[PDB]
């Protein structure tokens, strides 16, 4: 959206993508998108502090050919505005696995059946400080 | 670019960019470009193992409106095909400072007078393993 945008990422199944960034002090939410391009996201990772009617909830969704799928909300919320947060992501043909700052990890279905992830983008509330490929 | 491409970097003067990657085992050379966009580069970092008459020489240049500037060549070459390569680049108003693995540093004039670096791209011979911003 307004943050870092990376293409030709070439992330393959099993590889661990580590993303560390600064959550804006006045952030009401932040976004980290992963997929083929801006209209095809295998993972729209959206922690919401107070936004879109939700409070302290991580909302995940997929975007296929521009269409948003069914959202999934997570069980925990290890985030806070104006702080550094790191997330670790891996995937296989069936699911993406996301590990959070608290070490908690959950899965989100790989609805685009991606065998490679080439696009990543952060919005204006998540300033990426480091990206690593394991 | 062939390799990783990142936009919206918004790297300001005084900020440092750290890039670590793996050089293709059969690479004749590899490239790391920095600038405003693909046609306006404040730094074309091109270590050449065997290309264009160069043998193990770091060639740097600027690109203005798609036109290559006057090349600069360094006295050391701490790189090798099939091995990891890490460089640290600091952006400043007058010059960019490049720090190599060995600790060797050199400067390259900010010919385009860029006030920020928003574009980064590695070519097909440089596989980025991690990038740290500021
Ligand atoms: O699904 C991701 C998508 O959600 C939009 O907001 C939704 C909100 O999540 C939902 O609970 C509500 O019922 O409808 C809203 C509008 O469709 C966000 O606006 C969009 O940016 C994405 O985050
Ligand atoms: O200047 C960077 C640019 O150089 C091109 O090759 C040059 C070569 O370095 C020079 O010695 C010769 O006189 O002209 C060639 C063509 O301009 C590379 O081909 C290009 O990829 C960049 O590396």
PDB file of N, CA and C in Angstrom, chain A residues 9 45 47 60 66 92 128:
ATOM      1  N   UNK A   9      10.286 -12.416  -5.433  1.00  0.00           N
ATOM      2  CA  UNK A   9      10.698 -12.967  -4.147  1.00  0.00           C
ATOM      3  C   UNK A   9      11.192 -14.404  -4.294  1.00  0.00           C
ATOM      4  N   UNK A  45      -2.263 -10.651   5.727  1.00  0.00           N
ATOM      5  CA  UNK A  45      -2.067 -10.731   7.182  1.00  0.00           C
ATOM      6  C   UNK A  45      -2.394  -9.354   7.749  1.00  0.00           C
ATOM      7  N   UNK A  47      -3.235  -7.514  11.306  1.00  0.00           N
ATOM      8  CA  UNK A  47      -3.523  -7.329  12.733  1.00  0.00           C
ATOM      9  C   UNK A  47      -4.288  -6.011  12.896  1.00  0.00           C
ATOM     10  N   UNK A  60      -6.986 -12.703   8.734  1.00  0.00           N
ATOM     11  CA  UNK A  60      -6.265 -13.208   7.573  1.00  0.00           C
ATOM     12  C   UNK A  60      -7.268 -13.495   6.476  1.00  0.00           C
ATOM     13  N   UNK A  66      -8.601 -10.756  -7.656  1.00  0.00           N
ATOM     14  CA  UNK A  66      -9.227  -9.550  -7.142  1.00  0.00           C
ATOM     15  C   UNK A  66     -10.321  -9.763  -6.110  1.00  0.00           C
ATOM     16  N   UNK A  92       3.319 -24.651   2.039  1.00  0.00           N
ATOM     17  CA  UNK A  92       3.358 -25.840   1.206  1.00  0.00           C
ATOM     18  C   UNK A  92       2.132 -25.658   0.320  1.00  0.00           C
ATOM     19  N   UNK A 128       9.010  -2.041   7.279  1.00  0.00           N
ATOM     20  CA  UNK A 128       9.911  -3.184   7.256  1.00  0.00           C
ATOM     21  C   UNK A 128      11.367  -2.781   7.486  1.00  0.00           C
TER      22      UNK A 128
END
